[PDB]
Amino acid sequence: MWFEVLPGIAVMGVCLFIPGMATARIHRFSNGGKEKRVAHYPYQWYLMERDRRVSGVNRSYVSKGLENID
Amino acid sequence: MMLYIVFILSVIFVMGFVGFSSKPSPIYGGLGLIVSGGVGCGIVLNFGGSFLGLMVFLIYLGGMMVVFGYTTAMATEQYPEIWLSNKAVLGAFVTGLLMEFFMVYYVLKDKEVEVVFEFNGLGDWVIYDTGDSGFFSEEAMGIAALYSYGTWLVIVTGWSLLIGVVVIMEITRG
Amino acid sequence: MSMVYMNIMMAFTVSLVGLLMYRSHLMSSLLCLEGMMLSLFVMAALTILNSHFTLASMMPIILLVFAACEAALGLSLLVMVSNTYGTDYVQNLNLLQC
Amino acid sequence: AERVAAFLKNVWAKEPVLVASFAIAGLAVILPTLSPYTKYSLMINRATPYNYPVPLRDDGNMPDVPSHPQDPQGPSLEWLKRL
Amino acid sequence: RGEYVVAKLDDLINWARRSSLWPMTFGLACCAVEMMHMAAPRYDMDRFGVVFRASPRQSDVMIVAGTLTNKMAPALRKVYDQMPEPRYVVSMGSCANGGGYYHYSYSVVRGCDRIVPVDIYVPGCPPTAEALLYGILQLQKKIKREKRLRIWYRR
Amino acid sequence: YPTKETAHWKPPPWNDVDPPKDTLVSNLTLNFGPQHPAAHGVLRLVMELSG
Amino acid sequence: PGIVELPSLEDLKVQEVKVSSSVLKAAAHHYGAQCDKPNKEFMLCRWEEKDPRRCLEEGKLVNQCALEFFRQIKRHCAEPFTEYWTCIDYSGLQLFRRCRKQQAQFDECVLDKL
Amino acid sequence: PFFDVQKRLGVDLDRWMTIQSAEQPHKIPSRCHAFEKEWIECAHGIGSIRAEKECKIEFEDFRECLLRQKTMKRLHAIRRQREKLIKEGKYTPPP
Amino acid sequence: SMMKWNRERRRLQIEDFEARIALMPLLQAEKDRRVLQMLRENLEEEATVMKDVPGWKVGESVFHTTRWVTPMMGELYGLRASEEVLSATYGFIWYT
Amino acid sequence: MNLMLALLTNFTLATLLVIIAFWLPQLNVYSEKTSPYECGFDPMGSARLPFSMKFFLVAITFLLFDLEIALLLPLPWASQTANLNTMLTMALFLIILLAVSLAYEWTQKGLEWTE
Amino acid sequence: MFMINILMLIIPILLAVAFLTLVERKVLGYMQLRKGPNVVGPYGLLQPIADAIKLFIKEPLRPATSSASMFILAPIMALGLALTMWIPLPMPYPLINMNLGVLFMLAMSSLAVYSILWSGWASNSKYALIGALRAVAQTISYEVTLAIILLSVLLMSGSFTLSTLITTQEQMWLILPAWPLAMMWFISTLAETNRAPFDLTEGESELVSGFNVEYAAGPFALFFMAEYANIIMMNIFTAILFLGTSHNPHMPELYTINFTIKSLLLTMSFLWIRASYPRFRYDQLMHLLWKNFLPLTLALCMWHVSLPILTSGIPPQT
């Protein structure tokens, strides 16, 4: 019966799900729980490099708020 | 060694050129021109021109595909020559590799070299601009200007491609 | 100059010498013409990109456009040389000595 | 009329792909002229601020220029919000 | 224990080889029609993992399905030799088995085992598609009995 | 001015047309079968191909 | 051919604004409104002088106004601002369109109190 | 041009790309814009023969900006000198 | 449908561009101080490195004009570590 | 570095699989096995002999048309120009001329393969 | 942490490809009133593993007349470039975020053709040569149309970034405003991936096996693996282009579920189409693209240049 084809489709589907799920979770893990920053243009890279210096730990994704003003 | 990426790619660029300039079978000549078009893409891309580098790579991939088809039809023989099959091919290939090797060796050792002319071997990074923080790509805006500033260029190139179609049909008709 | 210029100019010289030193296949030499454009494209692109000369960013594209016209014309003649002789050898193209 | 209506039906019968091709290409050339919205396309492109707006040295005789971004003077994008 | 490991590894490679048998698209006469019927929906050889492929380079089994003539004999040997190993031959039908009803002919090879080694002989003129399917399953069980790595171990 | 090197030179054709050559414009020959899906397994179709 | 003058390190010493780009982007619209004057004075000086060394004093007033601007927020709207740029900071592209609700809370706070 | 039809007809076929200080898209300036402006304005209207001598100062600077050859010799000498001291234990680069 | 959404996307792009324009004076002010400090540091370490050399004058301009010139990557990151030079030169181009 | 790592990993894994494929199986090499394939009979002549191209004219045209796409790819960026009158004209001018050349080659029978 | 991400990409791709072969055999089986693999494992689930192991313990052959280096290079390049086509795909986040991700894929797709050309040529065999030259003809047929179709669609997206296609289709699938392009694109990907009714470089019933007739065992498997990896990748590319999935930044897995379903269903249609039609003759493929798709693609490119300008709906550059 045609539904005997589904188990192969399901296994193929789970395999194709993993790359999309893995990349999303890894990006959160590597960027302190946020989306990885996108820097398509030089301005966005400039702001990233500033955040790397401003952080104090050389990590562009560690962000400082009003607690860093005196 | 990563600060010398552009130089390393340019070494492979020359090796590809020596590959097809020694003129083995055009099958292998095409391959060397593909390798040179690949690293050439990387060299241009590393100066901020991703579009230009990708275009030349794409255009030469199409051109070499047609050359391959023409080779099997019009430039083949029983025993196509690799670089080792012919003394003239091998001799030209060896000479180019040795000339390139001694240029690379001396420029690296001294951080400078004179190959007829003076070249600085400090690495290509030193000449880069230090103040980029615009929210666009300068290569894109320059290329995009072909349709606003480059009216006259569009006309002559557009005409030449039309004439190219006309002309190749005249030439190849008996 | 920068050390990248040494290799790109070397590449242009290699393909020029490959062009002037023929063997037999006319196709092999037509490749050297394509190579010479590739070196000219790369060297022009580097100078324009490094100097930030924005409007000149389009001329390497124009360079490629006329490279294809030049290559297409070269292939058109190679076809006609092959039809006449059955090979693309350049030694066959010697009727005009006399 | 009868020459062309006859002509069109022939090509419609034989080469509908080319009839569709020429009809679409003809519209692209013609409609931009008859469209009331074509003017906004250029206004939106100019209203996009890719560059910093370098201020002018106030010499005392510049009423049409504003002193602050929130002043009434200067171009407004109210037409753009509505659009 | 090496004995246990090589025993298991034979099971693995034997299972892979018998579970993925790709016969050469090769048929000679009548018996090729019954072979086509074995691929047809009722028996569906593909459901066993048995897939026809045209190239000898990509084939594991030669089913000699029909009469082998003297004119065709070198060609059959050529395509058998061009099969990568391991390779198996199934002789299908009386003609391929021993010449059959053209046995005394001047132009007929009296059995394809004069030309190639044969693993399974399937009798019939023609064997029914089911008789051939029985022969293929018999080849699978033969492959299942192979002891390549056990014999290598004890060398 | 005749020389040894130009001894073999001949005047060009009156109408500038040199005779067509026949350097070998040979066809490709192909065994289409017997072992071939479309050859029914016992047809050696020897086929001369141009392209 | 002539040495290049440089300011002393002490000449370049200022109290920097140590907040991340997401904080700046959250405050950018109000910051442009509240600090337009020293900002435009400094920009006018750069495009006229064409010299980073001839604009240092104007540059320091950009910082002093920015720090004052951020101290005002910390006084009155420290919490609603924190939710707002935190939401901006999550986005890979730092999009305004993903945070309109927290922007409203921040906007109605500075409007009401400042 | 051999026939200056562009300047006759008041049409701009290609003068817009000739120099890098010309008006660029979105007012993006070239790296050597100031040097080219200064050289061009120095030599305008007096002819090449005079400009070669009289605008030499502006041209060498423009050339220095374009190829940066004297900058690299100054940096090459320092980098070479620093390593000549590193081995001799006579220098400690800062943190 | 595509016309309406693209218009909205254009309005959003302008709002994002204006946010950048608001912050540019601060970023520019910071860029000027950073460039001048890095040059000041390089000058001080040139002084020691090229001290006993015969005729060297420290911090000599290669230009006749006294006009300000933007430094190139070598002049700014001349002596610093590779990882900092590599980030400054190729970091943007190599970022994903 | 991410991209070069991704490229290095992709082709390394492919190379590793080839290495396993060539060094893990049992080999049995002899002349008849490795001879060229041609349906059971020995090939007539070499496979390096010339193979006529009947679409030679289309292949050359592909070169000229492939450069057009390089000229047309920047159009999404060109639509951001304020000078929209000029770009639209020149954008349409280029495409029409590309269409004209196709019409010329089509009508002159350049798209039909030689016999 | 990036190398782990790379492996969480390659390994699923290869496993998805392996089980695509099972799914194809089953779907063709049932569309042909039979069952397909159902003995090797339950419901034939282990059939792909048996095929993979079998092929890699099969003796590989180097033909006596082949050019050894290009013979080995070509299958490596095919699989290596097949995996490289996946690194810019946003699902919803790409492994490598590229400004010109669309162009990168055009370049890598064009370079993947040479794995057909050089494998077929390096074999030094007539059926492999014929198959290779069919690849030249088939590339000449589709690429010019294929890139111009992308250009027409991107005139609504506004950039060559693949992630921007998600933003473009937040309110609606692009298949509505561009279904004429979606049809010609879908057919182009069939020819791009050498799939029926355009399965001409292998052309089994005419060329025995075409460009890979001389390949056996592992080297053959690489071409098979590359071919099926490009089936999936180009149907994912189609889903991103024309059936955009909404992205919720805080629950990206919802995107990956809906996105995966669409790509699977598109991949099924490749099997569905293979089960339904005969094969084009490779000169008829060229005339399909150059005399039907190209005239209409050129016309639609003009239309999609003008339409945003005349409707004042030009997309943002960023």
Ligand SMILES: CCCCCCCCCCCCO[C@@H]1O[C@H](CO)[C@@H](O[C@H]2O[C@H](CO)[C@@H](O)[C@H](O)[C@H]2O)[C@H](O)[C@H]1O
């Ligand atoms: C083989 C040779 C082929 C040559 C073919 C050339 C075809 C060119 C046809 C004209 C195409 C452009 O047509 C023209 O476009 C511009 C903008 O795009 C429109 O311009 C309109 O909108 C713009 C801004 O959006 C306004 O600045 C302008 O005032 C207004 O009139 C014109 O109303 C229209 O007439």
Ligand SMILES: CCCCCCCCCCCCO[C@@H]1O[C@H](CO)[C@@H](O[C@H]2O[C@H](CO)[C@@H](O)[C@H](O)[C@H]2O)[C@H](O)[C@H]1O
């Ligand atoms: C601006 C973009 C849109 C513009 C479209 C550009 C492409 C135009 C295509 C060429 C149109 C005229 O050129 C072409 O000439 C031949 C005559 O040999 C016509 O007719 C011929 O070709 C068709 C199809 O091959 C055959 O069915 C017919 O038997 C034959 O008479 C074509 O139907 C016509 O298409």
Ligand code: SF4
């Ligand atoms: S064995 Fe019988 S059925 Fe088979 S080929 Fe011979 S005669 Fe025909």
